[PDB]
Amino acid sequence: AIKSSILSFNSINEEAEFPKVLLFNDNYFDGNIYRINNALSGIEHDPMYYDLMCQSMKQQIEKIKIPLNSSETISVFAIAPQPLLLYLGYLLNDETNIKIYQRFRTGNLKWNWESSEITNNFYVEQLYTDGNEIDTEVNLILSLSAEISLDRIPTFSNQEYKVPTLILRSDRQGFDAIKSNEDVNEYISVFRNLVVEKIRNDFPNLKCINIFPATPVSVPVRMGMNYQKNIDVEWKIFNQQTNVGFIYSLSLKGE
Ligand SMILES: Nc1nc2c(ncn2[C@@H]2O[C@@H]3COP(=O)(O)O[C@@H]4[C@H](O)[C@@H](COP(=O)(O)O[C@H]3[C@H]2O)O[C@H]4n2cnc3c(N)ncnc32)c(=O)[nH]1
Protein backbone atom coordinates (compact mmCIF):
# COMPACT_ATOMS: atom_id res chain seq x y z
CA ALA A 1 0.00 0.00 0.00
CA ILE A 2 2.97 2.24 0.74
CA LYS A 3 4.97 -0.30 -1.31
CA SER A 4 6.56 0.88 -4.56
CA SER A 5 8.68 -0.86 -7.14
CA ILE A 6 11.42 1.01 -8.98
CA LEU A 7 11.88 1.37 -12.73
CA SER A 8 15.31 2.68 -13.76
CA PHE A 9 16.37 3.89 -17.22
CA ASN A 10 19.70 5.68 -17.75
CA SER A 11 21.06 5.88 -21.29
CA ILE A 12 23.05 9.12 -21.09
CA ASN A 13 24.60 4.88 -11.26
CA GLU A 14 22.48 6.68 -8.63
CA GLU A 15 20.31 3.60 -8.07
CA ALA A 16 21.42 3.29 -4.43
CA GLU A 17 19.67 6.64 -3.75
CA PHE A 18 16.28 5.64 -5.17
CA PRO A 19 14.89 3.80 -2.08
CA LYS A 20 15.58 6.90 0.00
CA VAL A 21 13.58 9.05 -2.43
CA LEU A 22 10.63 6.67 -2.03
CA LEU A 23 10.67 7.17 1.76
CA PHE A 24 10.38 10.95 1.30
CA ASN A 25 7.27 10.49 -0.86
CA ASP A 26 5.03 8.20 1.23
CA ASN A 27 6.49 5.00 -0.22
CA TYR A 28 9.02 2.33 0.60
CA PHE A 29 10.89 0.04 -1.77
CA ASP A 30 9.14 -3.30 -2.24
CA GLY A 31 12.22 -5.14 -3.54
CA ASN A 32 11.32 -5.12 -7.25
CA ILE A 33 13.61 -2.99 -9.43
CA TYR A 34 13.15 -3.12 -13.20
CA ARG A 35 16.29 -1.94 -14.99
CA ILE A 36 15.79 -0.98 -18.64
CA ASN A 37 19.02 -1.93 -20.37
CA ASN A 38 20.89 0.53 -22.61
CA ALA A 39 21.06 -2.09 -25.31
CA LEU A 40 22.66 -0.21 -28.19
CA SER A 41 25.19 1.85 -26.31
CA GLY A 42 28.14 2.19 -28.68
CA ILE A 43 25.90 2.93 -31.68
CA GLU A 44 24.59 6.24 -30.26
CA HIS A 45 26.01 7.73 -33.48
CA ASP A 46 24.25 6.34 -36.47
CA PRO A 47 20.77 7.35 -37.68
CA MET A 48 19.29 3.95 -36.69
CA TYR A 49 19.90 4.64 -32.96
CA TYR A 50 16.32 5.56 -32.08
CA ASP A 51 14.74 2.77 -34.14
CA LEU A 52 16.94 0.16 -32.49
CA MET A 53 16.59 1.59 -28.97
CA CYS A 54 12.80 1.72 -29.29
CA GLN A 55 12.70 -1.93 -30.34
CA SER A 56 14.84 -2.91 -27.35
CA MET A 57 12.77 -0.84 -24.90
CA LYS A 58 9.50 -2.24 -26.25
CA GLN A 59 10.65 -5.85 -25.88
CA GLN A 60 12.02 -5.17 -22.38
CA ILE A 61 8.80 -3.54 -21.18
CA GLU A 62 6.58 -6.28 -22.66
CA LYS A 63 8.50 -9.00 -20.83
CA ILE A 64 7.71 -7.32 -17.47
CA LYS A 65 4.15 -6.01 -17.93
CA ILE A 66 2.82 -8.80 -15.71
CA PRO A 67 5.17 -7.99 -12.76
CA LEU A 68 4.87 -4.24 -13.50
CA ASN A 69 1.08 -4.15 -13.35
CA SER A 70 1.16 -6.12 -10.09
CA SER A 71 2.98 -3.21 -8.40
CA GLU A 72 1.10 -1.11 -5.85
CA THR A 73 3.07 1.90 -7.10
CA ILE A 74 5.84 2.19 -9.69
CA SER A 75 8.48 4.90 -9.09
CA VAL A 76 10.34 5.85 -12.29
CA PHE A 77 13.86 7.33 -12.46
CA ALA A 78 14.57 7.86 -16.16
CA ILE A 79 17.22 9.98 -17.88
CA ALA A 80 17.87 9.61 -21.62
CA PRO A 81 17.45 11.63 -24.84
CA GLN A 82 14.03 13.25 -24.74
CA PRO A 83 12.62 11.09 -27.59
CA LEU A 84 13.38 7.90 -25.63
CA LEU A 85 11.87 9.41 -22.48
CA LEU A 86 8.74 10.16 -24.51
CA TYR A 87 8.74 6.57 -25.80
CA LEU A 88 9.23 5.20 -22.28
CA GLY A 89 6.17 7.09 -21.08
CA TYR A 90 4.22 5.80 -24.07
CA LEU A 91 5.20 2.23 -23.14
CA LEU A 92 4.20 2.74 -19.50
CA ASN A 93 1.15 4.83 -20.49
CA ASP A 94 -0.48 4.71 -17.04
CA GLU A 95 -0.85 7.99 -15.14
CA THR A 96 -2.50 6.40 -12.07
CA ASN A 97 -0.15 4.25 -9.94
CA ILE A 98 3.05 5.59 -11.54
CA LYS A 99 5.27 8.32 -10.06
CA ILE A 100 7.77 10.01 -12.42
CA TYR A 101 10.75 11.61 -10.67
CA GLN A 102 12.92 14.53 -11.77
CA ARG A 103 16.72 14.72 -11.55
CA PHE A 104 18.30 17.86 -10.08
CA ARG A 105 21.92 18.94 -10.42
CA THR A 106 22.47 19.52 -6.68
CA GLY A 107 21.12 18.17 -3.41
CA ASN A 108 21.50 15.35 -0.89
CA LEU A 109 19.12 13.23 -3.02
CA LYS A 110 19.44 14.33 -6.65
CA TRP A 111 16.10 12.71 -7.55
CA ASN A 112 13.93 14.04 -4.72
CA TRP A 113 11.59 16.95 -5.45
CA GLU A 114 12.88 20.41 -4.55
CA SER A 115 9.37 21.61 -3.66
CA SER A 116 5.91 20.32 -2.75
CA GLU A 117 3.91 23.15 -4.34
CA ILE A 118 3.54 24.86 -7.70
CA THR A 119 6.69 26.88 -8.44
CA ASN A 120 6.21 27.68 -12.14
CA ASN A 121 3.60 28.71 -14.69
CA PHE A 122 3.28 27.41 -18.26
CA TYR A 123 1.80 29.38 -21.13
CA VAL A 124 1.26 29.25 -24.88
CA GLU A 125 2.17 31.55 -27.75
CA GLN A 126 0.54 30.96 -31.13
CA LEU A 127 2.32 32.29 -34.21
CA TYR A 128 -0.78 32.05 -36.41
CA THR A 129 -3.96 34.11 -36.31
CA ASP A 130 -6.71 31.62 -37.23
CA GLY A 131 -7.03 27.90 -37.68
CA ASN A 132 -8.27 26.43 -40.95
CA GLU A 133 -9.51 23.18 -42.48
CA ILE A 134 -6.51 22.62 -44.80
CA ASP A 135 -3.37 22.36 -42.66
CA THR A 136 -2.56 18.87 -41.42
CA GLU A 137 0.64 19.57 -39.47
CA VAL A 138 1.60 21.90 -36.65
CA ASN A 139 5.02 22.68 -35.14
CA LEU A 140 5.16 22.72 -31.32
CA ILE A 141 8.19 24.25 -29.58
CA LEU A 142 8.65 23.28 -25.90
CA SER A 143 10.90 25.90 -24.32
CA LEU A 144 11.27 24.97 -20.63
CA SER A 145 14.95 24.19 -19.95
CA ALA A 146 15.90 26.94 -22.41
CA GLU A 147 14.32 29.16 -25.04
CA ILE A 148 14.58 27.57 -28.50
CA SER A 149 14.95 30.48 -30.91
CA LEU A 150 12.81 30.26 -34.01
CA ASP A 151 15.75 30.29 -36.42
CA ARG A 152 16.48 26.72 -35.25
CA ILE A 153 13.11 25.32 -36.40
CA PRO A 154 13.04 24.02 -40.01
CA THR A 155 10.69 26.49 -41.69
CA PHE A 156 9.46 26.62 -45.28
CA SER A 157 10.36 29.71 -47.26
CA ASN A 158 7.07 30.03 -49.17
CA GLN A 159 4.00 31.40 -47.40
CA GLU A 160 1.61 28.78 -48.78
CA TYR A 161 3.71 26.03 -47.16
CA LYS A 162 4.60 27.57 -43.77
CA VAL A 163 3.54 25.22 -40.97
CA PRO A 164 1.46 26.80 -38.16
CA THR A 165 3.56 27.00 -35.01
CA LEU A 166 2.89 27.23 -31.26
CA ILE A 167 5.32 27.66 -28.36
CA LEU A 168 4.79 26.28 -24.86
CA ARG A 169 7.05 28.17 -22.41
CA SER A 170 7.46 28.52 -18.62
CA ASP A 171 7.87 31.78 -16.65
CA ARG A 172 11.08 30.35 -15.20
CA GLN A 173 13.22 28.75 -17.89
CA GLY A 174 16.27 26.73 -17.02
CA PHE A 175 17.28 23.35 -15.62
CA ASP A 176 14.94 23.82 -12.63
CA ALA A 177 11.80 24.63 -14.65
CA ILE A 178 10.25 21.64 -12.84
CA LYS A 179 10.77 21.63 -9.08
CA SER A 180 7.72 19.65 -7.90
CA ASN A 181 5.32 16.96 -9.05
CA GLU A 182 2.76 19.76 -8.80
CA ASP A 183 4.76 21.62 -11.48
CA VAL A 184 4.64 18.63 -13.86
CA ASN A 185 0.93 18.09 -13.21
CA GLU A 186 0.27 21.71 -14.19
CA TYR A 187 2.51 21.43 -17.25
CA ILE A 188 0.61 18.34 -18.42
CA SER A 189 -2.74 20.11 -17.93
CA VAL A 190 -1.56 23.05 -20.06
CA PHE A 191 -0.01 20.71 -22.64
CA ARG A 192 -3.16 18.61 -23.00
CA ASN A 193 -5.87 21.25 -22.71
CA LEU A 194 -4.33 24.48 -24.04
CA VAL A 195 -1.99 22.94 -26.64
CA VAL A 196 -2.88 19.47 -27.90
CA GLU A 197 -6.66 19.84 -27.77
CA LYS A 198 -6.49 23.50 -28.86
CA ILE A 199 -4.47 22.60 -31.97
CA ARG A 200 -7.05 20.03 -33.01
CA ASN A 201 -9.87 22.55 -32.45
CA ASP A 202 -8.02 25.08 -34.63
CA PHE A 203 -7.00 22.53 -37.30
CA PRO A 204 -9.76 19.92 -37.43
CA ASN A 205 -7.96 17.84 -40.08
CA LEU A 206 -4.70 17.68 -38.10
CA LYS A 207 -2.61 14.57 -38.74
CA CYS A 208 0.71 15.34 -37.09
CA ILE A 209 2.35 17.46 -34.37
CA ASN A 210 6.08 18.09 -34.82
CA ILE A 211 7.68 18.52 -31.38
CA PHE A 212 10.92 20.49 -30.87
CA PRO A 213 11.78 20.25 -27.17
CA ALA A 214 14.12 21.59 -24.51
CA THR A 215 12.62 20.03 -21.37
CA PRO A 216 13.74 18.31 -18.15
CA VAL A 217 13.47 14.53 -17.82
CA SER A 218 10.11 14.30 -16.05
CA VAL A 219 8.30 16.22 -18.81
CA PRO A 220 8.78 13.88 -21.83
CA VAL A 221 8.02 10.79 -19.76
CA ARG A 222 4.79 12.34 -18.51
CA MET A 223 3.87 13.48 -22.05
CA GLY A 224 4.35 9.93 -23.29
CA MET A 225 2.07 8.63 -20.53
CA ASN A 226 -0.48 11.28 -21.55
CA TYR A 227 -0.62 10.03 -25.16
CA GLN A 228 -4.02 8.53 -26.04
CA LYS A 229 -3.30 5.53 -28.24
CA ASN A 230 -5.31 5.44 -31.52
CA ILE A 231 -7.01 8.69 -30.44
CA ASP A 232 -4.25 11.32 -30.55
CA VAL A 233 -2.64 12.21 -33.89
CA GLU A 234 0.97 11.36 -34.75
CA TRP A 235 3.48 13.11 -32.48
CA LYS A 236 6.83 13.37 -34.28
CA ILE A 237 9.63 14.26 -31.86
CA PHE A 238 12.81 15.93 -33.09
CA ASN A 239 16.10 16.11 -31.23
CA GLN A 240 18.77 18.78 -31.08
CA GLN A 241 22.04 17.19 -32.17
CA THR A 242 25.48 18.79 -32.28
CA ASN A 243 26.35 20.62 -35.53
CA VAL A 244 23.16 19.45 -37.28
CA GLY A 245 20.17 21.15 -35.62
CA PHE A 246 16.87 19.44 -34.88
CA ILE A 247 16.66 15.99 -36.50
CA TYR A 248 13.60 13.72 -36.54
CA SER A 249 13.96 10.96 -33.93
CA LEU A 250 10.74 8.92 -33.61
CA SER A 251 6.95 9.13 -33.51
CA LEU A 252 4.12 8.20 -31.20
CA LYS A 253 1.50 6.94 -33.63
CA GLY A 254 -1.79 5.09 -33.73
CA GLU A 255 -2.19 1.68 -35.30
N1 LIG B 1 20.43 24.09 -22.44
C1 LIG B 1 19.74 23.89 -23.71
N2 LIG B 1 19.22 22.59 -24.03
C2 LIG B 1 18.51 22.39 -25.31
C3 LIG B 1 18.31 23.38 -26.23
N3 LIG B 1 17.65 22.83 -27.26
C4 LIG B 1 17.45 21.52 -26.96
N4 LIG B 1 17.99 21.28 -25.74
C5 LIG B 1 17.85 19.94 -25.32
O1 LIG B 1 16.96 19.95 -24.19
C6 LIG B 1 17.57 19.21 -23.11
C7 LIG B 1 17.61 20.15 -21.87
O2 LIG B 1 18.61 19.69 -20.94
P1 LIG B 1 17.95 19.36 -19.39
O3 LIG B 1 19.15 19.06 -18.55
O4 LIG B 1 17.04 20.38 -18.74
O5 LIG B 1 17.05 17.91 -19.63
C8 LIG B 1 17.79 16.80 -20.19
C9 LIG B 1 16.84 16.04 -21.01
O6 LIG B 1 15.55 15.96 -20.39
C10 LIG B 1 17.41 14.65 -21.00
C11 LIG B 1 18.26 14.43 -22.27
O7 LIG B 1 19.35 15.47 -22.30
P2 LIG B 1 19.80 16.17 -23.74
O8 LIG B 1 19.57 15.16 -24.86
O9 LIG B 1 21.21 16.73 -23.73
O10 LIG B 1 18.61 17.35 -24.01
C12 LIG B 1 18.89 18.72 -23.54
C13 LIG B 1 19.21 19.59 -24.68
O11 LIG B 1 20.10 19.00 -25.61
O12 LIG B 1 18.19 14.57 -19.84
C14 LIG B 1 18.19 15.82 -19.11
N5 LIG B 1 19.53 15.97 -18.62
C15 LIG B 1 20.71 15.96 -19.27
N6 LIG B 1 21.68 16.08 -18.35
C16 LIG B 1 21.10 16.15 -17.14
C17 LIG B 1 21.65 16.28 -15.90
N7 LIG B 1 23.00 16.40 -15.39
N8 LIG B 1 20.87 16.33 -14.81
C18 LIG B 1 19.52 16.26 -14.95
N9 LIG B 1 18.97 16.12 -16.20
C19 LIG B 1 19.77 16.08 -17.29
C20 LIG B 1 18.87 24.77 -25.90
O13 LIG B 1 18.75 25.69 -26.64
N10 LIG B 1 19.56 24.96 -24.66
Numbering used by the authors: 122 to 133, 142 to 384
Task: Provide the publication's sentences verbatim.
Here, we present the biochemical and structural characterization of two CBASS systems, composed of CdnG and Cap5, from Asticcacaulis sp. and Lactococcus lactis. We show that CdnG from Asticcacaulis sp. synthesizes 3′,2′-cGAMP in vitro, and 3′,2′-cGAMP is the biological signaling molecule that activates Cap5 for DNA degradation. The structures revealed that both Cap5 form homodimers, resulting from the side-by-side packing of two HNH domains.
The structures of the SAVED domains of LlCap5-SAVED and the full-length LlCap5 are essentially the same (rmsd = 0.4 Å). In our structure, 3′,2′-cGAMP is found at the center of LlCap5-SAVED. Employing a similar evolutionary approach to describe the structure of LlCap5-SAVED, 3′,2′-cGAMP is bound at the interface of these two CARF-like motifs. Specifically, the adenine base is stacked between the side chains of I208 and R234, which is further stacked by the side chain of F304. The side chain of R234 also forms a hydrogen bond with the 2′−5′ phosphate linkage. The involvement of the side chain of R234 for both base-stacking and phosphate-hydrogen bonding appears to be only feasible with the 2′−5′ phosphate linkage, indicating R234 is the discriminating residue to distinguish 3′,2′-cGAMP from 3′,3′-cGAMP. On the other hand, a single residue, R281, is responsible for the recognition of the guanine base.
